[PDB]
């Protein structure tokens, strides 16, 4: 029951916190099921990253004070990484499982992308400077892996 | 998945059935928005969505080969149903129209990821005709998220 934009603002923040701490999971199985090492490399970099980015969140978390992360699941995120597996045990180790498995991460990166570009524009606008700041780093993160991820998917 | 085209045909018969989902849902989400402008966005990006549903029609009719499987795209009815949760959980005012251009940007942006992947992989099949109708869908779904990112910043007037 969202009845201000902060109580938008928290709703999502913990949305995304769920999504990251899920992902930590996740992206080490997909690393494990690739077939090219580049990938399972681009998996495995982007693993160090998210940690990173769940840290950047629990900073806002102890700034602001008056933000509290909502324990919920992301269940969108949920249903992406879950895709990812599905690919993993429906190809061989081969290019075939990269390509499916390159759409799969992809997909998984711009639920973030859309994802975090809301909460920047939100937290501009309830006064969040900082924290506007560091989801941005965190925005950019994301777009440049899923470009990364492009071109693995092109190379 | 044996192969590069049974991935391109997986994809695309999800794409398609997220395309046709998206024409309910953008509808009954013009019908709970507050401002006349995200009403408006949303029914004009729902006529994009039709002419779409169409690219991928034509693409189908001229391959031959490629058959559009009847399936769900669950990760779309997902994304759409947290939108009509919005709505429900939102008096008709700014706050339900910050969080359903939220939801709305999450649609689009697994719109464009589909699209992205289904370009790279529609030039590689040698599909030249089908890659660039795709690229077309996905350069107006980029758009529709820009425009959305307008209206989310122009949703609050206080400063
Ligand atoms: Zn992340
Ligand atoms: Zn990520
Ligand atoms: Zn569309
Ligand atoms: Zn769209």
Redesign the pocket.
Same mark, same amino acid.
Request: glycine share 0%; hydrophobic share 20%; no cysteine.
């Given at each position: 029951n969202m009845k201000s934009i902060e109580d938008v603002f928290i709703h999502l923040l913990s949305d995304t916190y769920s999504?990251?701490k899920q992902?930590t999971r996740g992206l080490a199985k997909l690393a494990r099921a690739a077939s090219s090492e580049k990938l399972s490399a681009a998996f495995n970099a982007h693993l160090e %990253?998210?940690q990173g980015?769940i840290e950047r969140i629990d900073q806002i978390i102890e700034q602001e004070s008056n933000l509290k992360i909502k324990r919920m699941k992301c269940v969108a995120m949920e249903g992406l990484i879950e895709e990812a597996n599905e690919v993993v045990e429906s190809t061989e180790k081969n290019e075939v499982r990269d390509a499916a498995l390159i759409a799969a991460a992809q997909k998984v990166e711009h639920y %973030?992308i859309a994802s975090y570009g809301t909460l920047v524009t939100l937290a501009e606008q309830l006064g969040y400077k900082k924290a506007a700041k560091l989801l941005a780093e965190?925005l950019e993160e994301?777009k440049q892996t899923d470009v990364k991820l492009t071109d693995l998917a092109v190379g």
């Open positions: 999504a990251e992902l %990253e998210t980015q %973030e965190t994301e």
